[PDB]
Amino acid sequence: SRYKDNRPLNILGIDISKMELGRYNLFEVSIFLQGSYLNPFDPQEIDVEGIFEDQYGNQYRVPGFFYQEYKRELKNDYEYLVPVGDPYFKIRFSPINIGSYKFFIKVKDKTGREVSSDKYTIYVKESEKPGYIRVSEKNWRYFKFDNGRQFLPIGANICWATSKGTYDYDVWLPKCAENGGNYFRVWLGPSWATFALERESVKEYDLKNAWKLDYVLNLAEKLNMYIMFCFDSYNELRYQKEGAYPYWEHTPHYEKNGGPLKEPKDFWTNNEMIKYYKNKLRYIVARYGYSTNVFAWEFWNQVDIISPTAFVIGEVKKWHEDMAKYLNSIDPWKHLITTSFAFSPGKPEIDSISGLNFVQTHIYKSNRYIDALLSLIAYKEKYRKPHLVGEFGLDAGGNDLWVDPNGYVIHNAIWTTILSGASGTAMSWWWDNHIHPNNLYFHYRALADFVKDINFLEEKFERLTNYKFNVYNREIKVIGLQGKKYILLWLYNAKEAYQYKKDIPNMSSKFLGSIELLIKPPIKVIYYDTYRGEKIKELDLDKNVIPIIEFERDLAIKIELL
C-alpha cells in the first residue's frame, strides 16, 4: 500500500491535453485528487471514470488509472527510469465519431463518497486513422479496420527487450516497419518481462513497466504498427520441476511470494485471484484501450502447458468465457480477444468460444513444416473466424539460430501461411538473436510488396485445387490461392526448400516446366523473385498453361484474370 491516501475525497486539478483533435486520436485527461484508498489499482478502493458522449447519443464510460511519469536514460547497456513528480490519475479516450463531445469526471472512493467535475466540451475533426481492427464481415478469414480497409498482419513476435528496454524497440520497430511490417506481439507477463504489470504483486501494477509499454505503443502509433498484448504466459503457472522455462516458484500469484494462490490450479477459481485479475483487465483497458494500435487482447501464451496439476479444461474454458465477457463489457472500443496454445491443433473446447474473436496456432516443427502449416490452416477453417499463426520456428530449442542464418525457415513459413488462407504471416520467434542481427527483414519486404495491391476481402480466395504439374526436371510443389480476379502461387523445390546451407539465391531465364489451371484466358502472368522482392518477368497468355521459369528454391507467381 505504498500509494495509500486517507483524506476526504476531492478533485484538486484537471489538465486536458487538447480541446481539438482528430478521429481515433488520443485525448488525455490528467487528474490530481485526494481521497481514502489503500490501493489506487483497485476500483473498490478508488474508482475514477470519465463519461464521454458524442453528438449522436453514444456514451463511453472510460475507467481511469494510476500513473507515474518517468524520464528514461540509457546507462550504457541498461535502461534506467527516473520518476518525475508525484503520481496521479489519468483518463485516456479516443473518439470514434467526429463532431462535438461532452465529458465529465466521476470519482468514488472506499467511503462511498462520490465527487464529479463539471462538463467539458471538445471537438473532433476527421483524420487519416483507419480505426480499430475487427473481423471482416465480408470474409471471416481476415481482419479489417473500421474504415473497411484490410488489416493483413505482417511481422514477428517482438515480445520483450534486453536490459536496454525501450531503446531496443527504438531499433527493432523502425527496421520492421520500413520492411513492410505492421504487426508485433508483446508480453505483459511473467514478472521478468519488459512490460510486466504484475512484477512484484498481483494486487498493484508496476508503473515503470507500464510507462515502457506506453512508450512502445506510442512508437507503434508513429510507425503504423499494431500490437497483440499477451497478458499472461504459461510459465507463471508451471512448477520448476516441470521444466520449459518454469516460473511458479517466483511468480507473485504464489502465496510464498505474497499472492493468494497455494498452487497454480487455484488460479481459475480463487475468488481473490479472479477479483485481482479483473482489476488488471480494468487497468489495461484504462491505460491502453483507447489505442487503435492495440490489435488484440490475448489472455494467455500457451495456457495448455501450465502445470498439468493446474489444467482443468472445464475451468479454463469457463474462465476464458467469463473473462472475455467481462473484458468486452468494460472495453469501450471492443478490441479483439484471443488466447493461445502450445499444442499446434489447439483446444477446440476453448477455441470455439464465441468471445474469442480469432484462433491461433503455435508450431515449432523441423520436418515438412510447410505441409504441417497447410494442414493446420485447412483444419482450423472449421471455426469460421480468422486464424493467426502466432508463433513459428524450426525448434523450440533454438536450433534456427545456427542452422538457418539466412532465414529460409521464416521465408518458407510466411509464404506458406499467406498463400494458404491464414489471416497474415506466420509470426517468427527469435526477433532479438536472429531476425535483427542477421538482418532478415528483407524476407518480409518481398512478401509485403507481393501482396500489397491485393484486396483479400474481395477476392473470395480458395486454396488452389485443380492444377496439373508438368515438370520432369524436379519435384516442384505449389501452395496457391484462386480468387475472383487473381491466382497467387508459391512454388517450391521440395529438395531445396528444406536445406539451409546455400547462399541467398541470386538468379534467370530458362524454361523449367508448366502448370495448367482451371481458369479462362486471357491472363497476365507476373513472375516474382521472393528474395529480391522484384518482378522477374511478365507474360501475356492466350491459354491456361503457365510456364514455370527456372528457380533455385522457390518462386512466386501472380496471375491476373483478364
Ligand X SMILES: OC[C@H]1O[C@@H](O[C@H]2[C@H](O)[C@H](O)[C@H](O[C@H]3[C@H](O)[C@H](O)[C@H](O[C@H]4[C@H](O)[C@H](O)[C@H](O)O[C@@H]4CO)O[C@@H]3CO)O[C@@H]2CO)[C@@H](O)[C@@H](O)[C@@H]1O
- Binding partner of 164, given ligand X, ligand BMA, none, CB within 5-8 angstroms per partner class: ligand BMA
Indicate which single residue of 45, 79, 168, 214 sits in contact with ligand BMA (rule: CB under 6 A).
168
Quote the CA–CA distance of 9 and 112 in Å, as a whole number: 10
Tell me how far CA of residue 491 lies from CA of 241, 404, 457, 479, in angstroms.
45, 20, 24, 6
Number of residues binding to ligand X, judged by CB under 6 A = 13
The one of ligand BMA, ligand X, none whose footprint includes residue 97, by CB under 5 to 8 A per kind, is: none
**CB of residue 73 vs ligand BMA: minimum separation in angstroms?**
15
Site membership for ligand BMA, residue 72 (CB under 6 A): no
Give yes or no for residue 80 binding ligand BMA (CB under 6 A): no
Contacts of 471 (CB under 8 A, 6+ apart): 512, 513, 514, 548
331 binds, among ligand BMA, ligand X, none (CB under 5 to 8 A by kind): none
Give the pairing type, strands 359-364 and 387-393: parallel
> Under the criterion CB under 6 A, does residue 175 sit at the interface with ligand BMA?
no
Output the nine-digit C-alpha cell for 381: 477453417
Nearer to ligand X, 401 or 526 (CB): 401
Count of alpha carbons within 13 Å of 166, Cβ hemisphere only? 21
Alpha helix (H) ranges present in 257-386? 271-288, 313-330, 348-351, 369-379
Residue 301 in contact with ligand X, rule: CB under 6 A: yes
Q: Does 235 participate in binding ligand X (rule CB under 6 A)?
A: yes
For ligand X, which residue of 124, 156, 342, 549 counts as binding (CB under 6 A)?
A: 342
- H or E segment to which residue 184 belongs: strand 183-187
Closer CB to ligand X, 192 or 511, in the complex: 192
| Position 339 contacts ligand X (CB under 6 A) | no
Lookup result for grid cell 531476425: 435
Select from 55, 59, 111, 162 the one that contacts ligand BMA (CB under 6 A). Answer: 162
Q: What is the 3-state secondary structure (H, E, C) of 27-51?
A: EEEEEEEEEEECCCCCCCCEEEEEE
Report if residue 171 touches ligand BMA, rule: CB under 6 A: yes
Q: State which of positions 401-460 bind ligand BMA (CB under 6 A).
A: 436
Given phi > 0 = left and psi -120 to 50 = alpha, else beta, which region is 487? Answer: beta
Quick one: DSSP state of residue 408?
A: H
- Least Å distance, CB 357 to ligand BMA, is 33
Nearer to ligand BMA, 166 or 423 (CB): 166
Q: 168 is in the binding site of which of ligand X, ligand BMA, none (Cβ under 5 to 8 A by kind)?
A: ligand BMA
Using the rule CB under 6 A, which residue among 396, 478, 539, 541 binds ligand X? 396
Smallest distance from ligand BMA to CB 251, Å: 26
CA-to-CA distance for 3 and 88, rounded, in angstroms?
A: 10
* Edge-to-edge strand ranges of the sheet holding 5-16: 5-16, 27-37, 78-93, 65-75
Give the amino acid at 212.
Answer: K
Chain position carrying cell 483478364: 562
Nearest distance, CB of residue 425 and ligand X, angstroms:
17
Cβ 199 to ligand X, closest distance in Å?
13
Which parts of 376-395 interact with ligand X (CB under 6 A)? Answer: 391
Query: At closest approach, how far in Å is the CB of 403 from ligand X?
Result: 15
Q: Degrees (nearest 5) of the Cα angle 457, 562, 509?
A: 100
Cβ atoms of residues 547 and 523 within 8 Å? no
In the complex with ligand BMA, the residue whose CB is nearer, 165 or 421, is 165
Count residues near ligand BMA (CB under 6 A).
Answer: 5
- Are residues 414 and 361 in contact, defined by beta-carbon separation less than 8 angstroms? no
**Least separation in angstroms between CB 92 and ligand X:** 29
Handedness of CA 32, 88, 333, 71 (dihedral sign): positive
CB nearest ligand BMA: which residue? Answer: 171
The number of C-alpha atoms within 13 Å of 403 and in the hemisphere containing its C-beta is 12
Decide: is 364 part of the binding site for ligand X (CB under 6 A): yes
**16 forms part of the interface with ligand BMA (CB under 6 A):** no
Out of 102, 134, 164, 532, which residue is the one contacting ligand BMA (CB under 6 A)?
164
Which residues sit at the interface with ligand X, rule CB under 6 A? 192, 233, 235, 244-245, 301-302, 342, 362, 364, 391, 396, 429
Which residues sit at the interface with ligand BMA, rule CB under 6 A? 162, 164, 168, 171, 436
